[PDB]
Design an enzyme around this catalytic site. Structure first.
Site, short mmCIF file in Angstrom:
data_model
loop_
_atom_site.label_atom_id
_atom_site.label_comp_id
_atom_site.label_asym_id
_atom_site.label_seq_id
_atom_site.Cartn_x
_atom_site.Cartn_y
_atom_site.Cartn_z
CB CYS A 225 37.59 39.95 41.37
SG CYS A 225 36.82 41.33 40.49
CG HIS B 257 36.14 43.10 44.91
ND1 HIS B 257 37.03 42.20 44.32
CD2 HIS B 257 36.04 42.42 46.33
CE1 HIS B 257 37.04 41.12 44.83
NE2 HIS B 257 36.70 41.19 46.16
CB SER C 56 40.11 40.42 46.95
OG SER C 56 40.46 41.60 46.90
C1 LIG Z 1 38.15 42.37 40.13
C2 LIG Z 1 39.31 42.71 41.05
O1 LIG Z 1 40.08 41.98 40.89
N1 LIG Z 1 39.13 43.70 41.86
C3 LIG Z 1 40.36 44.19 42.62
C4 LIG Z 1 39.95 45.43 43.17
C5 LIG Z 1 40.95 46.11 44.12
C6 LIG Z 1 41.14 46.09 45.40
C7 LIG Z 1 42.16 46.68 46.11
C8 LIG Z 1 43.06 47.36 45.41
O2 LIG Z 1 44.04 48.16 46.06
C9 LIG Z 1 42.97 47.55 44.02
C10 LIG Z 1 41.95 46.99 43.65
C11 LIG Z 1 40.64 43.07 43.66
O3 LIG Z 1 39.71 42.57 44.28
O4 LIG Z 1 42.05 42.91 43.81
C12 LIG Z 1 38.79 42.20 38.73
O5 LIG Z 1 37.72 41.56 37.87
C13 LIG Z 1 39.53 43.32 38.35
O6 LIG Z 1 40.00 43.16 37.40
O7 LIG Z 1 39.06 44.74 38.36
C14 LIG Z 1 39.86 45.79 38.33
C15 LIG Z 1 41.18 45.61 39.26
#
Ligand SMILES: *[C@@H](C(=O)N[C@@H](Cc1ccc(O)cc1)C(=O)O)[C@@H](O)C(=O)OCC
Lengths: 33, 249
Positions: free
Chosen positions: B113, B148, B165
């Site tokens: 993200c 997120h 996402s």
């Molecule tokens: C931000 C990112 O990718 N966030 C994830 C958040 C998420 C949503 C739903 C589930 O089940 C798990 C995690 C996303 O949007 O997919 C990115 O910079 C990051 O690495 O954040 C930690 C995951």
């Protein structure tokens, strides 16, 4: 021999990118179900 | 939330980071060792096309351009490998982050993200009538917190979002919401539909369209505690943020 050295670096990146996407497909299918 | 590894030495991935990536795969995949043995060194893997960076005719309306920007972001794929391939230092000058976004388009690897927010800025600097501002969401589910971030956008007084996402409902929104509150409430409802409680929203200021700007992105211009605020003050605070952005030129 700088042009050949860049060639080796570009090939490294190409081989790595192909493995990254093959792995990403596997891990995406795992994360979904 | 859940920890992940970051490639901190550029591309090609250095040997130690590369091994760490595969060691992590063998840990979390029920077939982890077999996965590596099939892929590593394989000479019959698919070629991945390098996605074409979209370019825009001046006659194309901005919302149509944004659809193409989002399609490009999606083409890179959400990174599920466990290793983030680009290190994003959020306090870097914009010009350095835009150099990184350029490298993301040249190397074309999967992203998550935050990388997508940087890419979305890079790919919309050509749209001075579009305002871009980060929106971060902290949610809660089953005893863990989740982070997120998306790139909020404002075109002609309507709000939308670009981003990446692992869930289809938590990134792209066409710029059609009349107010910033309506946009954020749509994300809140989308989170609720997959059983996440929205805890905090952090909204940034408008981002310069100059890719050589030495300004930092201001990620946390408003930090909103959703439950503490309650409904009415939540909306009022989002309205106030929208006004603050209209005056940053
Ligand atoms: C931000 C990112 O990718 N966030 C994830 C958040 C998420 C949503 C739903 C589930 O089940 C798990 C995690 C996303 O949007 O997919 C990115 O910079 C990051 O690495 O954040 C930690 C995951």
């Amino acid at each position: 021999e700088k042009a050949k050295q860049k060639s080796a670096q570009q090939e490294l990146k190409q081989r790595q990118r192909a493995e990254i996407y093959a792995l990403n497909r596997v891990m995406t299918e795992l994360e979904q179900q | 939330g859940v920890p992940f590894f970051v490639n901190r030495g550029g591309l090609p991935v250095d040997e130690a980071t590369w091994e760490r990536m595969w060691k992590h795969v063998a840990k979390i995949h029920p077939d982890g060792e077999k996965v590596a043995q099939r892929i590593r060194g394989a000479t019959d893997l698919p070629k991945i096309p390098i996605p074409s960076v979209p370019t825009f005719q001046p006659s194309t309306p901005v919302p149509e351009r944004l659809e193409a920007v989002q399609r490009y972001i999606r083409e890179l794929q959400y990174n599920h490998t466990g290793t983030q391939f680009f290190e994003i230092k959020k306090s870097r000058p914009l010009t350095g982050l835009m150099d990184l976004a350029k490298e993301m388009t040249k190397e074309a690897l999967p992203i998550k993200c935050l990388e997508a927010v940087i890419l979305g800025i890079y790919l919309t600097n050509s749209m001075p009538t579009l305002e871009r501002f980060p929106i971060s969401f902290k949610t809660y589910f089953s005893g863990n917190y989740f982070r997120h971030i998306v790139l909020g956008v404002n075109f002609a007084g309507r709000y939308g979002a670009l981003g990446m996402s692992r869930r289809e409902d938590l990134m792209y929104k066409p710029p059609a919401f009349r107010t910033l509150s309506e946009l954020v409430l749509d994300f809140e409802a989308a989170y609720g539909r997959c059983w996440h409680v929205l805890k905090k929203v952090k909204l940034g200021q408008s981002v310069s369209h100059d890719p050589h700007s030495v300004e930092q992105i201001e990620w946390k211009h408003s930090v909103l505690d959703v439950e503490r605020l309650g409904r009415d003050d939540f909306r009022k605070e989002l309205e106030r943020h929208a006004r603050d952005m209209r005056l940053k030129i």
